[PDB]
Amino acid sequence: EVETFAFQAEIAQLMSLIINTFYSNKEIFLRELISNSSDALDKIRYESLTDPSKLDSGKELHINLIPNKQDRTLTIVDTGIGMTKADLINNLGTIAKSGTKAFMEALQAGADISMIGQFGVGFYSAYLVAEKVTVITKHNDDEQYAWESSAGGSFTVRTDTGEPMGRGTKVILHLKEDQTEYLEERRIKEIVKKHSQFIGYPITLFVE
Numbered sequence: 036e037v038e039t040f041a042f043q044a045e046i047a048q049l050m051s052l053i054i055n056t057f058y059s060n061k062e063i064f065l066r067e068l069i070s071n072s073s074d075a076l077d078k079i080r081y082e083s084l085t086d087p088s089k090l091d092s093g094k095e096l097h098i099n100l101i102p103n104k105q106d107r108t109l110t111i112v113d114t115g116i117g118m119t120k121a122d123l124i125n126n127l128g129t130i131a132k133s134g135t136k137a138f139m140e141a142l143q144a145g146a147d148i149s150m151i152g153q154f155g156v157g158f159y160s161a162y163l164v165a166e167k168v169t170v171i172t173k174h175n176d177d178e179q180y181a182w183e184s185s186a187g188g189s190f191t192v193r194t195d196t197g198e199p200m201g202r203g204t205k206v207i208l209h210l211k212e213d214q215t216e217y218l219e220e221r222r223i224k225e226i227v228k229k230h231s232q233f234i235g236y237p238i239t240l241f242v243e
């Protein structure tokens with residue numbers, strides 16, 4: 036059972052802009068995804084202060100970076116609060132309609148694509164380097180779901196019965212053929228040190 040949805044016009048326009056605009060500084064996609072993981076981890080940390088049972092689905096708060104050269108994928112895994120099915124469908128928990136508007140207005144006032152995260156739509160910077168993105172998530176209040184999109188105006192949502200996660204979100208980037216540098220250990224280390232050196236959770240870079 037696969038459900039197919041149309042992106043709202045503003046989000047489809049944002050995705051087309053990220054895919055078709057000439058912009059060389061693509062590495063910022065990783066900072067944006069680590070930042071989103073950190074926000075998810077802050078949220079489960081805060082909720083767990085008053086209700087420690089929210090950590091029954093996993094006490095470890097961390098971020099893993101998993102490159103796979105054979106599949107040409109870079110996966111970012113976190114054990115944050117996760118997302119419900121309703122949040123996935125509602126632009127992955129983002130204010131994507133108003134955020135896209137504010138980002139578009141900023142771009143005309145002197146901003147560049149690297150400032151995308153300031154408008155709450157940093158997730159979509161994944162399309163600077165990925166031809167397809169799969170988001171697997173598990174929130175304490177819902178079942179495990181997989182969201183997927185190759186852009187083109189639509190996304191799918193399905194239940195995910197393979198590999199239960201416990202709690203959190205997994206973003207799988209199916210890299211564009213000319214963006215395989217982001218699977219190289221030295222390149223990932225460089226980007227984490229440059230843009231994410233002070234994140235408040237352990238970031239483990241897996242090796243092959």
Ligand SMILES: CCCc1cc(-n2c(=O)[nH]c3ccccc32)c(O)cc1O
Pocket residue numbers: 068071072074075076078113115116117118127128158170172203204206
């Ligand atoms: C999948 C869209 C963006 C994104 C979102 C999340 N995320 C969640 O899964 N729950 C969140 C609650 C607050 C902030 C970000 C959250 C994440 O853990 C990683 C991630 O890359």
